[PDB]
Structures are given as C-alpha cells and as structure tokens.
C-alpha cells in the first residue's frame, strides 16, 4: 500500500563507511561571502528552533566558508490515543561555502530511543540493514527509522532552498 519508492537504493548515502545525507545548491549569483552569511543565519535560526542546549553552531571559519552545528530534536514515528512513539536524534549539519554554491551535509546522526537504547545511522538505516536483499523493500523492523530519517533530511534540504529564495512547497 505505501509507496516507499524514496526510500529505496541511494536514500541513504555513506561516506568514508558513515552516513552522511547531503545536498548542493547552485546560487551563481553569489559571491562566498553572501552565501556564508546566508548559510550563518539559517543554522542559527534553525537550531535555535530546537530549543534546547544541544543546539547550537559550534565552528565557522568565514575564510574559508566552513560552519558546523550540533542538533537535538525529537523524530515521531506514530501517536495513538495512548501511545506517543518517538525517539531522539543527534546530529551535527556541516555546510561548505564557495561562491555560487553550498554543500549541505547531516552527518553524526545517533538516536537516543525510550532514554537508554543507543544506536548508530550506520549500524540501523544504511542498506545493509534496512533494505531486503533485492533492495525493493524496507525491512519492516527498520522502516520506521529509515523513512523518518530521510524525511528529516529532505526536510532540511528545503529549508535550505527555502532560504536561498525557493518558494516553500511544503504544507
């Protein structure tokens, strides 16, 4: 019934042997320094958003157009009337400025699930764990994490557009 086309084959990019969720953004107009700028502002409101202590930019370096924030928010997989299913996720957004474009990247990204299981992206929602043999299913079990975690993703890269001037699609 669901169509998880999405969250098949390539969803979930690992470099170096972690998972690493990324996005380019071709601004041509802009020199390094407006999109730095940019860049700075969005982070900042974004994590501020979070409202709480683990969210926060931790590193920028204007020169070279680099910026690193660490994350933590809630990700809810379903609610009932009795049951409220959700978990907590790290992570830490790195962005790259050049002039004319931007490197996003989610990276780092743990969850904190019922307050004391850990697990690891890489160990959890890479396809080797995820994905059935033939990589045409997500694994029932795993589902929930890899497509949350996805949608979490894609729902940054539209922010991002989104403060680069894209019109907000989202409802």
Same mark, same amino acid.
């Given at each position: 019934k669901k169509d998880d086309t999405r969250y098949l084959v390539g969803a979930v990019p690992e470099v170096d042997g972690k998972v690493v969720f990324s996005k380019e953004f071709q601004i041509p107009g802009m020199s390094q320094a407006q999109i730095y700028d940019t860049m700075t502002k969005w982070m900042d409101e974004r994590l501020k958003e979070n409202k709480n202590i683990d969210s926060r930019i931790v590193f920028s370096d204007e020169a070279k157009g680099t910026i690193a924030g660490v994350g933590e928010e809630w990700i809810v997989f379903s609610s009932s009337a009795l049951s409220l299913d959700r978990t907590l996720v790290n992570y830490q957004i790195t962005v790259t400025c050049k002039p004319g474009n931007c490197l996003v990247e989610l990276e780092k990204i743990r969850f904190?699930?019922?307050?004391?299981? @850990?697990? =690891?992206?890489?160990?959890?929602?890479?396809?080797?764990?995820?994905?059935? @043999?033939? =990589?045409?299913?997500?694994?029932?079990?795993?589902a929930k994490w890899r497509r949350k975690t996805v949608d979490f993703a894609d729902d940054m890269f539209m922010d991002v557009a989104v403060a680069f001037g894209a019109p907000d699609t989202r409802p």
């Open positions: 904190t699930y019922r307050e004391t299981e @850990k697990y =690891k992206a890489e160990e959890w929602i890479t396809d080797k764990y995820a994905l059935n @043999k033939a =990589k045409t299913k997500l694994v029932r079990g795993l």
